[PDB]
From a paper:
The extracellular domain is responsible for ligand recognition and contains multiple leucine-rich repeats (LRRs) that form a horseshoe-like structure. Here, we use computational protein design to create novel miniproteins that bind to human TLR3 with nanomolar affinities. Cryo-EM structures of two minibinders in complex with TLR3 reveal that they bind the target as designed, although one partially unfolds due to steric competition with a nearby N-linked glycan.
Following a strategy previously established for structural characterization of TLR4/MD-2 complexes, we co-expressed the TLR3 ectodomain and each minibinder in HEK293F cells and co-purified the complexes using affinity chromatography followed by SEC. This improved occupancy, and after optimizing grid preparation and data collection to overcome a clear preferred orientation, we determined cryo-EM structures of minibinders 7.7 and 8.6 in complex with TLR3, each at 2.9 Å resolution. Minibinders 7.7 and 8.6 interacted with the concave surface of TLR3 in slightly different manners, with α1 and α2 of minibinder 7.7 binding to LRR15-LRRCT and α2 and α3 of minibinder 8.6 binding to LRR13-LRRCT. Unlike minibinder 8.6, for which clear density was observed for all three α-helices, we could build only α1 and α2 of minibinder 7.7 into well-defined density. Interestingly, density corresponding to α3 of minibinder 7.7 could be observed extending from α2 at a low threshold (0.08σ). Given the proximity of the minibinder to the glycan at N413, we conclude that a steric clash between the glycan and minibinder 7.7 makes α3 protrude out from the complex. This conclusion is supported by our SSM data for minibinder 7—obtained in complex with TLR3—which showed that mutations in the hydrophobic core were more tolerated than would be expected for a well-folded protein. For minibinder 8.6, the α2 and α3 helices were well-aligned (Cα RMSD: 1.6 Å), but α1 was slightly displaced from its predicted position (Cα RMSD: 2.7 Å). The altered conformation of minibinder 7.7 α3 described above may result in exposure of hydrophobic residues in the protein core to solvent (e.g., L11 and L30). The interactions between minibinder 7.7 and TLR3 were mainly mediated through electrostatic interactions. Due to a nearby glycan, the third helix of minibinder 7.7 was disordered when bound to TLR3, a phenomenon that has not been documented before in designed minibinders to the best of our knowledge.
Numbering used by the authors:
A (entry chain A): 27 to 335, 343 to 696
B (entry chain B): 1 to 40
Write the structure that this text describes.
């Protein structure tokens, strides 16, 4: 019937007309979320003596007799969604007061009649989302004394009146939804009648001028803390709007997607207590210095796409925001950084510049001077079409932790004059760059680096110098991939003992392990004792030295994949003990031996020897089948992937189907 | 350890590649991140 895990009979989608009538009587959450019922009589419900959370949403119910609440005193939450309870009665639930929540979304109620509910001793939440109510006259006398979160989410309301809220004379409202409902009037006095109206929501409602000013004057001398004015058409700002909000102790605001085209003058100076600020997605075209007056208590700023595709951010237009901590100037057409742009933001901790500049092709020394007095922790700086980094463009940044310089066009030949300072650098994101030629002293000025990401960067001059990574001693992740590197000496990793991940993925090292190379194969995987993941993939090594993996003892994953490698030498994994995985996908391995691959399969957990064309004979795969008989190693699927290919005698067979006793 | 920031790094590089158009590495990074999450 219905799956029951512990105490929930989750009848998810079982189109039914009657209750199941066969579940244990101690179930509570009879989650019949679509089961097309039409009546809930007080006879079948008798067995359900421990029902707690009756959820029958998305159903077609038109009547609820009071007898239903006779047999359910333990009910806590009811959720009647998308029903047809247009008609309501005084006794549909009158004595039925033990709820802890209530929801009646999309019941299509056009009238509240007289007083559908008058006790409501424990009603925390009440939702009327998509009904069509045109008032707030939910009663006639004092009631709802314990309601917290009322939701008039989307209705046909037109105004607000003092008399209609008299029922809320002593109700502590926390977060009041009046969103998505065109209001065109506010009669004098609405919210001082309500005892503890804290929140307020006016999103997706067109207020505009001649209404916003009257609203903010109406809110006067009220205990409102949050606010919401998203998508409300507000093309400008003046010192007369939000004037009445000088007496409110308001701690939040929301003015996003409203297309604030221009900011006139000293505005917001009437909001000295604003702690959050949402002006994202605006069509702003200018920014005067006196635009942001008095916002000295704002802690979060959201300007992701306010500055539209040229704006002229005036001089010293940020000096007033003395308490800003999070900046969101991400996706704008800001034309370059002026010398007096970001002055005074000494509380800044997050910059988020990415796709903002159409002028930052280069970074000169006198370009980041504005942030000299401002501490900085995260410097995003991605894909602003940066061309080249000149000398000492990061001198003014001393507390910086992340230099996330990826998706850029940085093509040059470094010398070490671009990271002057940056003694507290913890991460550089140099991936996805055009080219970067090295020297022996390019990273000598950053001994504190911990994460050198060098993927998809055509990295030359890697072997000619003594060691480009010799100064690096606190490096843990060395991402070196998609660079077409094809010549390496014992210089990658000299003194780098705390390196943990050494990806070398799309590299042409195939020719430098061969046995015909003068001086022997290059044994560059040396000196490593704390390497966790070493992805030597997609290179083309058709050979492995017997002692190529001597230094690696605690290594976990030793992935060698997508190569032309076969004929594994014996004892190749002899010394690796804590080798929690292998991977030799898409190779030419055909024969497995108890010495070649025995000691490696001890404490294993995964294998992906997927597409190698196994030779299928009683000696080629015998230990392998006797080992896959009992799989303490959670190997992935063995169906239609491991196949017998070489010998025509028994060709075309999965490995497990081999007969062990025949040989 | 950097294992947690490594499972964050693979994801972020996956969105970077997806915005740049490298689906095969996106799939490999997702599978590798899931496997490392299993092993952690
Ligand atoms: C909010 O309360 C203040 C008082 O704290 C009101 O200020 C009074 O305003 C009237 C005229 O508007 C003056 O005659 C009083 O002297 C003021 N009282 C003061 C300054 O303490 C303010 O008007 C109220 N806001 C309203 C009614 O919207
Ligand atoms: C709001 O800004 C307006 C400007 O548009 C101010 O109006 C000026 O006020 C000064 C000082 O009283 C007077 O010269 C004129 O009344 C206005 N001058 C100009 C050039 O417009 C207004 O005073 C500001 N404050 C309020 C409360 O409206
Ligand atoms: C930023 O770099 C420019 C270019 O080097 C510096 O301008 C030079 O300053 C020195 C010192 O006064 C002068 O002798 C040169 O004539 C200037 N021009 C050139 C082309 O060198 C500028 O001083 C640097 N600013 C800072 C703060 O270091
Ligand atoms: C620098 O900014 C970029 C762009 O916002 C950040 O990349 C985002 O990372 C989150 C976290 O995984 C993803 O959900 C977004 O999709 C990424 N954005 C894009 C455009 O792909 C990046 O994380 C920031 N740098 C740091 C160090 O956090
Ligand atoms: C509820 O009834 C089921 C049905 O047998 C039983 O397995 C479970 O232990 C019962 N739980 C309680 C708390 O009585
Ligand atoms: C009840 O079922 C709905 C529909 O899937 C689900 O969203 C909700 O989380 C369920 N409630 C439970 C299981 O308590
Ligand atoms: C139900 O409400 C009554 C009346 O307030 C109260 O006495 C009783 O303790 C409540 N029981 C539960 C389980 O809520
Ligand atoms: C105002 O909104 C913020 C963010 O959602 C929330 O943390 C805060 O609790 C809200 N204020 C009140 C009084 O609930
Ligand atoms: C904030 O201002 C209102 C307006 O008078 C006042 O009622 C409220 O008590 C103030 N908040 C605090 C914490 O004093
Ligand atoms: C606001 O008005 C003052 C009046 O002293 C003026 O100095 C300032 O430039 C104005 N700001 C504007 C027009 O952005």
């Amino acid at each position: 019937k219905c799956t029951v895990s512990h105490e929930v009979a989750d009848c998810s989608h079982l189109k039914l007309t009657q209750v199941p009538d066969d579940l244990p009587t101690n179930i509570t959450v009879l989650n019949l979320t679509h089961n097309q019922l039409r009546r809930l009589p007080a006879a079948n419900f008798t067995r359900y003596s421990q029902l707690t959370s009756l959820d029958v949403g998305f159903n077609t119910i038109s009547k609820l007799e009071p007898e239903l609440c006779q047999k359910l005193p333990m009910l806590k939450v009811l959720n009647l969604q998308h029903n047809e309870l247009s008609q309501l009665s005084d006794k549909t639930f009158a004595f039925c007061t033990n709820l802890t929540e209530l929801h009646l979304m999309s019941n299509s109620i056009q009238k509240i009649k007289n007083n559908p509910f008058v006790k409501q001793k424990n009603l925390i939440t009440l939702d009327l989302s998509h009904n069509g109510l045109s008032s707030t006259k939910l009663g006639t006398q004092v009631q709802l004394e314990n309601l917290q979160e009322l939701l008039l989410s989307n209705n046909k309301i037109q105004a607000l009146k003092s008399e209609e809220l008299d029922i809320f004379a002593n109700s502590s409202l926390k977060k009041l939804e009046l969103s998505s409902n065109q209001i065109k009037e506010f009669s004098p006095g609405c919210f001082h009648a309500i005892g503890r109206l804290f929140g307020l929501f006016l999103n997706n409602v067109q207020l505009g001028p001649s209404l916003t000013e009257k609203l903010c004057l109406e809110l006067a001398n009220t205990s409102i803390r949050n606010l919401s004015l998203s998508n409300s058409q507000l093309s400008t700002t003046s010192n007369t709007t939000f004037l009445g909000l000088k007496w409110t102790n308001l701690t939040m605001l929301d003015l996003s997607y409203n297309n604030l085209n221009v900011v006139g003058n000293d505005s917001f100076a009437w909001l000295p207590q604003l702690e959050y600020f949402f002006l994202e997605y605006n069509n702003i075209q200018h920014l005067f210095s006196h635009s942001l007056h008095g916002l000295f208590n704002v802690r979060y700023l959201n300007l992701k796409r306010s500055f539209t595709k040229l704006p002229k951010i005036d001089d010293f237009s940020f000096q007033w925001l003395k308490c800003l901590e999070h900046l969101n100037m991400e996706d704008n057409d800001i034309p370059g950084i002026k010398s007096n742009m970001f002055t005074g933001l000494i509380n800044l901790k997050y910059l988020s510049l990415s796709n903002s500049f159409t002028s930052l092709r280069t970074l000169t020394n006198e370009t980041f001077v504005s942030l000299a007095h401002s501490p900085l922790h995260i410097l995003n700086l991605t894909k602003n079409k940066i061309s080249k980094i000149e000398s000492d463009a990061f001198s003014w940044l001393g507390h910086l932790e992340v230099l996330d310089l990826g998706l850029n066009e940085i093509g040059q030949e470094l010398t070490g004059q671009e990271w002057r300072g940056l003694e507290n650098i913890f991460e550089i994101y140099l991936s996805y760059n055009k080219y970067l030629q090295l020297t022996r002293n390019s990273f000598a000025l950053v001994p504190s680096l911990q994460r050198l990401m060098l993927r998809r960067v055509a990295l030359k001059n890697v072997d000619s110098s003594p060691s480009p990574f010799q100064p690096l001693r606190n490096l843990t992740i060395l991402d070196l991939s998609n660079n077409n590197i094809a010549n390496i000496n014992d210089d990658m990793l000299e003194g780098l003992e705390k390196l943990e991940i050494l990806d070398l993925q799309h590299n042409n090292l195939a020719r430098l392990w061969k046995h015909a190379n003068p001086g022997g194969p290059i044994y560059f995987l040396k000196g490593l004792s704390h390497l966790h993941i070493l992805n030597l993939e997609s290179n083309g090594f058709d050979e492995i030295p017997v002692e190529v993996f001597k230094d690696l003892f605690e290594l976990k994953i030793i992935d060698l994949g997508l190569n032309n490698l076969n004929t594994l030498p014996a004892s190749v994994f002899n010394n690796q003990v804590s080798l929690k995985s292998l991977n030799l996908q898409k190779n030419l391995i055909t024969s497995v031996e108890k010495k070649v691959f025995g000691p490696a399969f001890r404490n294993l957990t995964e294998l992906d020897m997927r597409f190698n064309p196994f030779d299928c004979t009683c000696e080629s795969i015998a230990w392998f089948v006797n080992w896959i008989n009992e799989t303490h190693t959670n190997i992935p699927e063995l169906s239609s992937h491991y196949l017998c290919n070489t010998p025509p005698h028994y060709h075309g067979f999965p490995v497990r189907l081999f007969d062990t006793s025949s040989c | 350890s950097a294992m947690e920031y490594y499972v964050k790094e693979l994801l972020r590089t996956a969105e970077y590649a997806r915005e740049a158009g490298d689906p095969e590495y996106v799939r490999k990074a997702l599978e590798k991140a899931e496997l490392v999450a299993r092993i952690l």
